[PDB]
Amino acid sequence: ALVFFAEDAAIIGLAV
Amino acid sequence: ALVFFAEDAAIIGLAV
Amino acid sequence: ALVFFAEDAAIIGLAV
Amino acid sequence: ALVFFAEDAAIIGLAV
Amino acid sequence: ALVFFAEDAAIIGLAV
Amino acid sequence: ALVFFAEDAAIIGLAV
Amino acid sequence: ALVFFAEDAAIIGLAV
Amino acid sequence: ALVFFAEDAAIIGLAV
Amino acid sequence: ALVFFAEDAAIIGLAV
Amino acid sequence: ALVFFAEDAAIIGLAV
Amino acid sequence: ALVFFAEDAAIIGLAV
Amino acid sequence: ALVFFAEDAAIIGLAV
Amino acid sequence: ALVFFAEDAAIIGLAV
Amino acid sequence: ALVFFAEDAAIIGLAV
Amino acid sequence: ALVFFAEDAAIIGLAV
Amino acid sequence: ALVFFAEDAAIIGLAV
Ligand SMILES: [Cl-]
Ligand SMILES: [Cl-]
Ligand SMILES: [Cl-]
Ligand SMILES: [Cl-]
Ligand SMILES: [Cl-]
Ligand SMILES: [Cl-]
Ligand SMILES: [Cl-]
Ligand SMILES: [Cl-]
Ligand code: NA
Ligand code: NA
Ligand code: NA
């Protein structure tokens, strides 16, 4: 899977 | 200040 | 600890 | 960016 | 060589 | 909008 | 009077 | 502080 | 390109 | 040294 | 004639 | 103008 | 008080 | 003699 | 590179 | 007085 990143603070991975 | 990023897991800031 | 100086504006201490 | 200072003579800035 | 400065108080040089 | 300029070093824009 | 400057594009004067 | 510029002629700084 | 500025009055850009 | 200014965006100095 | 600007400190005009 | 520096703690500028 | 700095070699403080 | 420092840009020495 | 010379006071090099 | 010039590095004046 791809992992995108976003600031949520902390940087988190978002899995696709 | 500058904030660098590193994978420590989770991505963290490092402040200078 | 050492304190280094940098312009960040204001002159700030950076502690090591 | 941070500007550090060093004697090189003359005192110069070093930009980061 | 470059001379950086730090408070160690007294100011000291750090040569590179 | 207008953009004014100031030295902060770097020259920055201020938007109005 | 003082003349300030802004980007409006062209640079214009603003009279005070 | 920020430094703005104006014609007063010669250009001068205005500190804020 | 770079844009230099000159008083020609009004301020104009000169592109390089 | 002289410092000239140009839009490069951001306004940068050019040292001579 | 054109007037260019430079920091010489004070901001000065340079006439061409 | 000249800018001198002093500890006031934090380092500050003094304009002359 | 203010503390100014001078090269005397070592960097020394001057207390005002 | 003492050497004080000021921003004039470049950092310059002032000798006393 | 070429080094040109100018009175800036003191005589300085300018590198091209 | 005459001023002669020598590379000493930097170019310096020598009074006579
Ligand atoms: Cl707005
Ligand atoms: Cl003034
Ligand atoms: Cl106009
Ligand atoms: Cl043109
Ligand atoms: Cl430059
Ligand atoms: Cl003050
Ligand atoms: Cl410099
Ligand atoms: Cl003296
Ligand atoms: Na502009
Ligand atoms: Na200058
Ligand atoms: Na001369």
Short mmCIF file of C-alpha atoms and ligand atoms in Angstrom, two decimals:
data_model
loop_
_atom_site.label_atom_id
_atom_site.label_comp_id
_atom_site.label_asym_id
_atom_site.label_seq_id
_atom_site.Cartn_x
_atom_site.Cartn_y
_atom_site.Cartn_z
CA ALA A 1 0.00 0.00 0.00
CA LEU A 2 0.88 3.67 -0.54
CA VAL A 3 1.36 5.84 2.53
CA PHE A 4 0.48 9.52 2.23
CA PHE A 5 1.36 12.05 4.93
CA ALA A 6 -0.58 14.83 6.60
CA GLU A 7 -0.26 17.18 9.53
CA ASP A 8 -3.03 16.29 11.99
CA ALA A 9 -0.29 18.49 16.01
CA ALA A 10 1.74 15.62 14.47
CA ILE A 11 2.56 14.20 11.06
CA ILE A 12 0.56 11.01 10.44
CA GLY A 13 0.43 8.31 7.72
CA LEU A 14 -2.55 7.56 5.72
CA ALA A 15 -2.71 4.25 4.16
CA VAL A 16 -3.99 3.39 0.74
CA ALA B 1 13.24 28.43 14.46
CA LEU B 2 13.68 25.71 11.81
CA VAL B 3 11.82 22.40 12.21
CA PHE B 4 13.37 19.38 10.55
CA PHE B 5 11.55 16.06 10.24
CA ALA B 6 12.67 12.50 10.84
CA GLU B 7 11.13 9.06 11.10
CA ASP B 8 11.70 7.88 14.68
CA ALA B 9 7.73 4.44 14.38
CA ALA B 10 6.37 8.00 13.85
CA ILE B 11 7.48 11.19 12.10
CA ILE B 12 8.70 13.77 14.60
CA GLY B 13 9.90 17.40 14.49
CA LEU B 14 13.24 18.51 15.50
CA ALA B 15 13.54 22.06 16.41
CA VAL B 16 16.35 24.38 15.86
CA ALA C 1 25.64 23.64 28.30
CA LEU C 2 26.94 25.93 25.53
CA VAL C 3 24.73 28.67 24.14
CA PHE C 4 25.20 29.58 20.49
CA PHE C 5 23.59 32.66 18.96
CA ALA C 6 21.61 33.17 15.79
CA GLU C 7 19.38 35.77 14.24
CA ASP C 8 15.91 34.23 13.93
CA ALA C 9 13.68 39.01 13.89
CA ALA C 10 15.55 38.62 17.18
CA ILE C 11 18.88 37.21 18.31
CA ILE C 12 18.16 33.86 20.03
CA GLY C 13 20.12 31.31 22.09
CA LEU C 14 20.54 27.82 21.02
CA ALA C 15 21.45 25.54 23.76
CA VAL C 16 23.61 22.53 23.59
CA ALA D 1 16.34 31.37 7.96
CA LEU D 2 18.76 31.40 10.90
CA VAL D 3 21.87 33.54 10.61
CA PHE D 4 24.90 32.34 12.56
CA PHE D 5 28.02 34.46 12.98
CA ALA D 6 31.70 33.68 12.65
CA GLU D 7 35.00 35.52 12.61
CA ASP D 8 36.64 34.87 9.24
CA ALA D 9 39.52 39.33 9.46
CA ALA D 10 35.78 40.15 9.72
CA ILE D 11 32.64 38.85 11.42
CA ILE D 12 30.45 37.28 8.73
CA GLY D 13 26.94 35.75 8.63
CA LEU D 14 26.16 32.28 7.76
CA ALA D 15 22.74 31.65 6.55
CA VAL D 16 20.68 28.57 7.14
CA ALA E 1 39.91 29.08 10.23
CA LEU E 2 36.40 30.26 11.21
CA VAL E 3 35.75 31.20 14.83
CA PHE E 4 32.26 30.60 16.20
CA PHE E 5 31.12 32.01 19.54
CA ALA E 6 29.26 30.48 22.45
CA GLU E 7 28.43 31.36 26.03
CA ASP E 8 30.02 28.74 28.29
CA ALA E 9 29.19 32.84 32.08
CA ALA E 10 32.03 33.71 29.61
CA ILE E 11 32.01 33.91 25.82
CA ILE E 12 34.45 31.46 24.23
CA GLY E 13 35.61 30.83 20.64
CA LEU E 14 35.27 27.70 18.79
CA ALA E 15 37.59 27.28 15.98
CA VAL E 16 37.04 25.48 12.84
CA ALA F 1 -4.68 43.75 -2.91
CA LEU F 2 -1.67 45.93 -2.13
CA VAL F 3 1.65 44.39 -1.17
CA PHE F 4 3.90 46.43 1.10
CA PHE F 5 7.49 45.42 1.82
CA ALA F 6 9.54 45.23 4.98
CA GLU F 7 12.94 44.00 6.03
CA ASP F 8 12.71 41.27 8.68
CA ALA F 9 17.26 39.13 7.35
CA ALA F 10 14.89 38.83 4.39
CA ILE F 11 12.55 41.24 2.64
CA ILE F 12 8.97 40.05 3.13
CA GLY F 13 5.59 41.03 1.65
CA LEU F 14 2.68 42.18 3.56
CA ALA F 15 -0.61 41.80 1.91
CA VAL F 16 -3.52 44.11 2.21
CA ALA G 1 5.22 64.13 3.13
CA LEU G 2 6.35 60.50 3.27
CA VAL G 3 5.89 58.28 0.23
CA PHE G 4 5.44 54.56 0.91
CA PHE G 5 5.51 51.96 -1.85
CA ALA G 6 3.23 49.07 -2.72
CA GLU G 7 2.84 46.56 -5.51
CA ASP G 8 -0.65 47.07 -6.93
CA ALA G 9 0.76 44.88 -11.44
CA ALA G 10 2.85 48.05 -10.87
CA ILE G 11 4.64 49.76 -8.01
CA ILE G 12 2.70 52.79 -6.78
CA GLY G 13 3.36 55.55 -4.23
CA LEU G 14 1.31 56.26 -1.27
CA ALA G 15 1.44 59.65 0.10
CA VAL G 16 1.36 60.47 3.75
CA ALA H 1 11.34 44.48 14.43
CA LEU H 2 10.17 45.10 10.85
CA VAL H 3 11.68 47.93 8.81
CA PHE H 4 9.46 49.67 6.27
CA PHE H 5 10.77 52.14 3.70
CA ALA H 6 9.64 55.57 2.55
CA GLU H 7 10.82 58.52 0.47
CA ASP H 8 11.25 61.58 2.74
CA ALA H 9 14.17 62.95 -1.77
CA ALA H 10 16.05 60.10 0.01
CA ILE H 11 14.73 56.71 1.11
CA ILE H 12 14.62 56.17 4.88
CA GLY H 13 13.72 53.25 7.21
CA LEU H 14 10.89 53.12 9.56
CA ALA H 15 11.15 50.72 12.37
CA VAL H 16 8.26 48.85 13.80
CA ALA I 1 13.90 36.36 -14.48
CA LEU I 2 15.16 39.02 -12.04
CA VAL I 3 13.31 42.32 -11.76
CA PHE I 4 15.32 45.40 -10.85
CA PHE I 5 13.66 48.68 -9.90
CA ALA I 6 14.29 52.26 -10.94
CA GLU I 7 12.64 55.64 -10.60
CA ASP I 8 11.84 56.90 -14.10
CA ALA I 9 8.06 60.20 -11.56
CA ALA I 10 7.15 56.47 -11.14
CA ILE I 11 8.91 53.24 -10.17
CA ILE I 12 9.41 50.82 -13.08
CA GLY I 13 10.68 47.22 -13.37
CA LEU I 14 13.52 46.15 -15.41
CA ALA I 15 13.63 42.57 -16.18
CA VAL I 16 16.60 40.41 -16.67
CA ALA J 1 29.82 47.00 -0.34
CA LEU J 2 26.70 48.15 -2.21
CA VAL J 3 23.54 46.08 -1.95
CA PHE J 4 21.15 46.16 -4.89
CA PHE J 5 17.68 44.66 -4.78
CA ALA J 6 15.74 42.49 -7.20
CA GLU J 7 12.55 40.48 -7.28
CA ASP J 8 13.54 36.86 -7.86
CA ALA J 9 8.96 35.06 -5.63
CA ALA J 10 10.93 37.28 -3.16
CA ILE J 11 12.98 40.46 -3.03
CA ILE J 12 16.65 39.49 -2.66
CA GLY J 13 19.90 41.45 -2.16
CA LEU J 14 22.74 41.50 -4.47
CA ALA J 15 26.01 42.39 -3.03
CA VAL J 16 28.74 44.30 -4.69
CA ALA K 1 17.46 59.70 -16.25
CA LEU K 2 16.83 56.48 -14.30
CA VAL K 3 17.53 56.28 -10.59
CA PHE K 4 18.55 52.90 -9.21
CA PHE K 5 18.74 52.22 -5.47
CA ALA K 6 21.35 50.55 -3.31
CA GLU K 7 22.26 50.24 0.34
CA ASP K 8 25.58 52.02 0.87
CA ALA K 9 24.51 52.71 5.95
CA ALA K 10 21.80 54.52 3.96
CA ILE K 11 19.76 53.81 0.84
CA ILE K 12 21.21 55.91 -1.98
CA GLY K 13 20.24 56.80 -5.56
CA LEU K 14 22.35 56.06 -8.46
CA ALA K 15 21.62 58.10 -11.44
CA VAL K 16 21.82 57.03 -14.99
CA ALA L 1 22.85 53.97 11.57
CA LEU L 2 25.08 51.56 13.52
CA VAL L 3 23.54 48.78 15.58
CA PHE L 4 25.36 47.69 18.74
CA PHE L 5 24.42 44.61 20.77
CA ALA L 6 23.90 43.98 24.46
CA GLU L 7 22.55 41.34 26.83
CA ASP L 8 19.45 42.70 28.62
CA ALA L 9 19.27 37.26 29.34
CA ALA L 10 18.30 38.04 25.68
CA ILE L 11 20.55 39.86 23.20
CA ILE L 12 19.06 43.14 21.93
CA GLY L 13 20.11 45.83 19.39
CA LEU L 14 20.90 49.35 20.12
CA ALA L 15 20.61 51.79 17.35
CA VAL L 16 22.86 54.73 16.89
CA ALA M 1 21.95 46.06 33.66
CA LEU M 2 23.07 45.90 30.01
CA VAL M 3 26.10 43.83 29.10
CA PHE M 4 28.12 44.94 26.07
CA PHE M 5 30.87 42.83 24.51
CA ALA M 6 34.40 43.63 23.41
CA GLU M 7 37.41 41.74 22.16
CA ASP M 8 40.23 42.37 24.64
CA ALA M 9 42.67 37.96 23.19
CA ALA M 10 39.24 37.07 24.69
CA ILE M 11 35.67 38.32 24.52
CA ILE M 12 34.76 40.15 27.75
CA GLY M 13 31.55 41.68 29.14
CA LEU M 14 31.08 45.21 30.07
CA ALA M 15 28.47 45.98 32.52
CA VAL M 16 26.28 48.99 32.38
CA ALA N 1 42.79 48.22 23.03
CA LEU N 2 39.15 47.05 23.09
CA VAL N 3 37.24 46.21 19.95
CA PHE N 4 33.48 46.69 19.98
CA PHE N 5 31.24 45.43 17.18
CA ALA N 6 28.37 46.97 15.28
CA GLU N 7 26.19 46.11 12.33
CA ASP N 8 26.53 48.71 9.56
CA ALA N 9 25.34 45.37 5.81
CA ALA N 10 28.56 44.12 7.43
CA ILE N 11 29.67 43.72 11.03
CA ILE N 12 32.46 46.23 11.68
CA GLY N 13 34.98 46.70 14.51
CA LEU N 14 35.31 49.77 16.51
CA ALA N 15 38.60 50.21 18.17
CA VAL N 16 39.22 51.83 21.49
CA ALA O 1 38.18 34.22 -12.11
CA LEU O 2 38.95 37.93 -12.57
CA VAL O 3 39.47 40.11 -9.50
CA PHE O 4 38.68 43.79 -9.89
CA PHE O 5 39.62 46.37 -7.26
CA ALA O 6 37.67 49.25 -5.75
CA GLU O 7 38.02 51.71 -2.91
CA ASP O 8 35.17 50.95 -0.50
CA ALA O 9 37.57 53.18 3.48
CA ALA O 10 39.77 50.32 2.18
CA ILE O 11 40.61 48.68 -1.13
CA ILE O 12 38.61 45.50 -1.71
CA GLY O 13 38.49 42.75 -4.38
CA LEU O 14 35.55 41.96 -6.42
CA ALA O 15 35.45 38.58 -7.85
CA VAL O 16 34.13 37.53 -11.15
CA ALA P 1 51.57 62.77 1.94
CA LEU P 2 51.93 60.13 -0.80
CA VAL P 3 50.12 56.82 -0.35
CA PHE P 4 51.69 53.71 -1.87
CA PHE P 5 49.83 50.42 -2.09
CA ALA P 6 50.85 46.87 -1.29
CA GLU P 7 49.23 43.48 -1.01
CA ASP P 8 49.70 42.37 2.61
CA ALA P 9 45.53 39.07 2.30
CA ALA P 10 44.35 42.64 1.56
CA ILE P 11 45.61 45.71 -0.26
CA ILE P 12 46.83 48.33 2.21
CA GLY P 13 48.06 51.95 2.08
CA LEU P 14 51.40 53.05 3.08
CA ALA P 15 51.94 56.57 4.00
CA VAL P 16 54.74 58.74 3.15
CL CL Q 1 -6.06 40.61 3.13
CL CL Q 2 17.50 58.76 8.18
CL CL Q 3 3.05 55.92 -10.39
CL CL Q 4 12.94 47.38 -20.10
CL CL Q 5 24.94 38.73 -2.92
CL CL Q 6 17.02 51.57 22.15
CL CL Q 7 29.57 40.48 5.58
CL CL Q 8 42.26 54.28 19.53
NA NA Q 9 7.44 43.27 -6.68
NA NA Q 10 26.00 48.29 2.23
NA NA Q 11 42.76 55.43 -3.46
#
